[PDB]
Amino acid sequence: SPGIWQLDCTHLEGKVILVAVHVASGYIEAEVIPAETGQETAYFLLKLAGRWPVKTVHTDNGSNFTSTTVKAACWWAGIKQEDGIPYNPQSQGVIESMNKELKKIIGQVRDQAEHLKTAVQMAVFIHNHKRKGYSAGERIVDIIATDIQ
Amino acid sequence: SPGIWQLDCTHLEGKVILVAVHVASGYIEAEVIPAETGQETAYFLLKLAGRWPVKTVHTDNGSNFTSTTVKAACWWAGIKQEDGIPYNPQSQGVIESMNKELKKIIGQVRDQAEHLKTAVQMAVFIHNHKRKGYSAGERIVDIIATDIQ
Ligand SMILES: CN(Cc1ccccc1C(=O)NCc1ccccc1)Cc1ccc2c(c1C(=O)O)OC[C@H](CCC(=O)O)O2
Ligand SMILES: CN(Cc1ccccc1C(=O)NCc1ccccc1)Cc1ccc2c(c1C(=O)O)OC[C@H](CCC(=O)O)O2
Ligand SMILES: [Cl-]
Ligand SMILES: [Cl-]
Secondary structure (H helix, E strand, O other): OOOOEEEEEEEEEEEEEEEEOOOOOOEEEEEEEEEOOHHHHHHHHHHHHHOOOOOOEEOOHHHHHHOHHHHHHHHOOOEEOOOOOOOOOOOHHHHHHHHHHHHHHHHHHHOOOOOOOHHHHHHHHHHHHEEOOOEHHHHHHHHHHHHHH | OOOEEEEHHHHHEEEEEEEEOOOOOOEEEEEOOOOHHHHHHHHHHHHHHHHHOEEEOOOOOOHHHHHHHHHHHHHOOOEEEEOOOOOOHHHHHOOOOHHHHHHHHHHHHHHHOHHHHHHHHHHHHHHHOOOOEHHHHHHHHHHHHHHHH
């Protein structure tokens, strides 16, 4: 499970926030895109996999699962592309809670930037650094390092 | 040194590739931008610092050191902004070598994408996964996890 990630798409201000969540740690990366296309999703996964050791991605919906551009990115980056069916129903609730948390943080910073993308990156920073006591950023590094060793 | 990063700007195809290098590991993040501005640099640092525990950034040039937008990003993200003067002359050679390596990789993948940004992300992936035997991606995680513990 050190290599498992989950995609998540949420909406704000008539734009799309694409999120990848490292399941085991709750660490996230995110970007603002005008719309959630296969090409946007593919590029996002390519970035993610160059930065972290991404073994498996649970796609956020059936369109991204189906997308041959997304499949091409997963092939390129050596990622196992999987569906995102919540066989464990707790997954649904976790993601919904996360989207609510992120939107709350974006609200708290929204006046510190003109553009939504800046606010989203501020929210990523706050989420990943928040101690709950370790932070998600500490947890992901410890989980992966333990795996390497 | 787990928290020390160096900025680096290189050019290709009439575009700018902005790179951050984790000094102790050689791990990199990079993006393609139309031009180096304070705003682009500030946004890049904001992204980097939300993803890794960035303590100190050696700026790539004096304009980015001076830029009040870059200083504002460093303030926001809790980064110590420093100059990039190669007091150790080996620094110069390392960054030059890295730029040549990255451009080499970009050439090797260039026909696998229409857009330069895609090729740059492929190059980031290849660089960070390359075993030198550990990869830069393994070294950065080990270095940071050892720091946390
Ligand atoms: C579609 N294209 C096809 C292609 C075109 C030419 C040669 C090979 C291929 C090919 O299939 N390569 C294999 C491959 C490797 C990795 C990932 C996917 C496929 C690749 C691609 C995907 C997402 C992008 C791209 C590009 C691009 O061509 O550069 O460009 C920027 C864009 C930014 C986000 C947005 O703007 O949506 O995301
Ligand atoms: C310039 N602006 C000033 C500002 C405007 C309104 C309110 C507060 C501030 C303010 O000073 N906040 C403190 C602050 C926090 C964090 C970093 C820097 C400053 C902030 C900013 C920087 C880089 C960006 C932005 C933005 C934006 O406003 O959203 O937008 C996307 C753009 C993308 C890259 C490109 O397009 O160059 O990079
Ligand atoms: Cl972090
Ligand atoms: Cl990696």
